[PDB]
From a paper:
In this study, we present the cryo-EM structures of two thermostable multimeric enzymes that have different point-symmetry groups; namely SOR from Acidianus ambivalens and LS from [name]. The reported cryo-EM structures of the two enzymes including their active sites correlate very well with the x-ray crystal structures. Due to their thermostability and relatively easy purification scheme, both SOR and LS can serve as a model for the catalytic and structural characterization of biocatalysts as well as a benchmark for cryo-EM sample preparation, optimization of the acquisition parameters and 3D reconstruction.
LS catalyzes the formation of 6,7-dimethyl-8-ribityllumazine by condensation of 5-amino-6-(D-ribitylamino)uracil with 3,4-dihydroxy-2-butanone 4-phosphate. LS consists of 60 identical subunits that form a capsid of icosahedral 532 symmetry with an outer diameter of 154 Å and inner compartment diameter of 80 Å. Further processing and refinement resulted in a cryo-EM map at a global 2.33 Å resolution as depicted in the FSC plot. The RMSD of both structures is 0.174 Å for the 154 Cα atoms. The LS monomer is composed of a central four-stranded β-sheet flanked on one side by two α helices and on the other side by three α helices. The residue R40L forms salt-bridges with residues D36L, E145x and a hydrogen bridge with residue G6x, while the residue R21F forms an ion-pair with E5x which itself interacts with R52F.
Residue numbers in the entry:
A (entry chain B), B (entry chain A), C (entry chain Q), D (entry chain F), E (entry chain x), F (entry chain b), ...: 1 to 154
The structure:
């Protein structure tokens, strides 16, 4: 039984982060979480590319441009979506998730999902560096593990 | 840490706008908002292409033709969908959003989402130049920022 | 401003684990979580000492014997306590936590708290490798960070 | 991975038992359970020291005198506390458990907890040789395992 | 099976009593009970030392001074605490019991608990020489038995 | 009547801060509050030592190491605890507070309590730089006053 | 980015305090709070001018006379208003606040607002040196910071 798995060392890995600007008060907590995870697992702060896009709808196209780069090992997508009073939330969330998944399959590169989809502001706050943890940290950890796994699988 | 972001200057950028004719009383408010945003951020009114399509279902194909043009930096899609008494609203909205997202990923060009999806006429009016702002203005601002970002990323 | 913090590399660190036997169906999930964390952060499986004690009441004395060893950098305490029908749960939990804290202060060595205190079996299952994570993994991560921090602070 | 654990053989081990006199109708069932466990696991009835104290408040000081003896491998504390109509139960139970835990940490010797803390007489009867087992038997089993474990760890 | 136990003869034993002054109408009934028990079990009224302290908070320090005396075989602590309208009762009771227990363990001398902790004046009266007995008598009996037990154990 | 009191000048005082990483979105607001208080009362930013520990359970041992340093005048402990669904909150909070108090008494050095213990996320947010103030600022002010008081009392 | 801010040192600053006589039982607590703040932040008790006016309606005119003095750096207004049974409270409070604000703008000198406006006596007591703090202390702290800020801005 051949077993493949990824270690949690970030030595020599290069990451891209695409972060939205809407709900920036929570998005920047998520971004700090992701960067802290990368640095404290042994990565270098100079191996991180950060792209800021105006809203969550624009994440897939910028992520596609970042992932088409040769010197990027994994891409981390970060955003916050909070349901309002219309179905706008439903359509935006479905499009963002579908776009990211299709892009990852097409380019054969890891793209981790770090987007919060909350019904209320209280849930959104809970998941951005509060009692339920930090989604940016989780997404960065997943990206590190997948980059190492793909390196060993290649 | 390399950081990329877009400025909010519209100097020398060329935009396309695809606007639907259905619910024209609100659509033309959205269109005026978008054009005003472009002009007052320093763009030229002669660098704007406007395509009118009969309904919101037809937005993706016209937007595809506009985005395949070489001299268009970003495309702004504008329409109004109001839920009626049948599931027709659900299927139209899902198809429009999916089509726009897939087109943007395929052509690697920014296509901003300026379509209102409202349950009631009151919500639709609120979002078209009333207490909750103007969605056309927001879509134009997003298009300006993404055009500048893609210019700097290229 | 001098800033001290611990990295998340487990290279060259030696750990002790004290695990109770009561509720072993959940305790062994917690133990597997802790060992997996240590190994995948770069530690060696031969640098791990495992002590099994009959119940959670006996954790502090065994942990004291383990922490008095010269070649142990941090100790991880693991157990599961589920409230029954008497105040027995209250007194056991208070004694275990107080004993571990006093021992850590006396010996000036990190002793991380990986004991689940649940009101119901459902909560206990949720916290032992289910939707709310794995407490053993969290305790091991804390032990790694504190061992590195104490190394840098010394 | 070095693994330490205790066997369940009582050959050559010497035990002390401290038993309270209050609620003697249940305490003597607990004592019979403990002695039967020790004897049927291969111990000798002549290697057992039994101290009787008037009440549960007095268990820690007598247990301390017993555990300071050189030829005692583990001490088993046995008593029954049943909640009455005042907070007296709360303070007695907290003091007894805290005293036993501190004594065990100070002397570095196993002291197992065999004290029943019940809200009602029915629960107390259930736990003293009835449908829920015998707490004295459980405490003796824990003492045997810890004595063997400490022997192997030394 | 070596068996140790204390007889109920008070011949040649010297006792100290620490009694609080607050709630003196019940405290002096408790004191009379304790002294009567000692005398009618064969002790001498000249072998009794009585210390009066202003309140129940001060019992542990005076009891410590009494128990550090060489010619005192056991110390009896006596007081009455009745819950009022604030948490003051909770903190006083917890401190008194903890102090007495720690002192007894440190000095290796019997200190019996004869403090009434009642929710209502009716319970306090019941336990001070009324239908539920006399707590001072019970504490003195415990002290006699422990003094004899420690003599035989030495 | 000799009267001793501390001034609120931080000139020439050296402080240590121990801050937990859990709930970092609120902890870093508390840390900014404490540092701002120290600096604007006339202290130097180079006289501040900052230690980061993984969780609130680990605060006492790191605080002990910091307070055993000769050139530290006071230590400020900072963390956030929010009640969840289990008694875990109760035991963690009791251990942290008891450990800090015992450490301060043993080392005869001021250790101020800046840990938020909240039932809900709303209370926690209120006490971390919102309508009810900033607990880090309060803890730093207390540390300054006690350092000056101990200087004058020595 | 030029940044201006005030320190919290009161060295060499001269303050005026205008205090009303009505509700003097709470007003004198507020006054003691303000004076204590000034003195313990390094000010001199001889640099404080205190004016007593009969009621809160008279605060603005006396404050105007104090602030027209050349050797006064900031003025602290202190009073207590408690709603009665008529709209008298509404008109008095509106006039006092408006007068103080207009005076501060006209004279270009800091005048801090230390007047309690409470619906009930319980709220008034809470805000005058009880669980919610002391408003006089807060007003004095604000005056110190603004005096330093205006000094640095000049």
């Amino acid at each position: 039984m051949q077993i493949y798995e990824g270690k949690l060392t970030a030595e020599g890995l290069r990451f891209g982060i695409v972060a939205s600007r809407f709900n920036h008060a929570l998005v920047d907590r998520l971004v700090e979480g992701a960067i802290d995870c990368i640095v404290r697992h042994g990565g270098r702060e100079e191996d991180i590319t950060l792209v800021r896009v105006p809203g969550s709808w624009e994440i897939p196209v910028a992520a596609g441009e970042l992932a088409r780069k040769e010197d990027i090992d994994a891409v981390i997508a970060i955003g916050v979506l909070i349901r309002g009073a219309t179905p706008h939330f439903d359509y935006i969330a479905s499009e963002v998730s579908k776009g990211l998944a299709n892009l990852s399959l097409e380019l054969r590169k890891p793209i981790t999902f770090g987007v919060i989809t909350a019904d209320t502001l209280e849930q959104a706050i809970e998941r951005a560096g509060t009692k339920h943890g930090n989604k940016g940290w989780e997404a960065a950890l997943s990206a590190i593990e997948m980059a190492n796994l793909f390196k060993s699988l290649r």
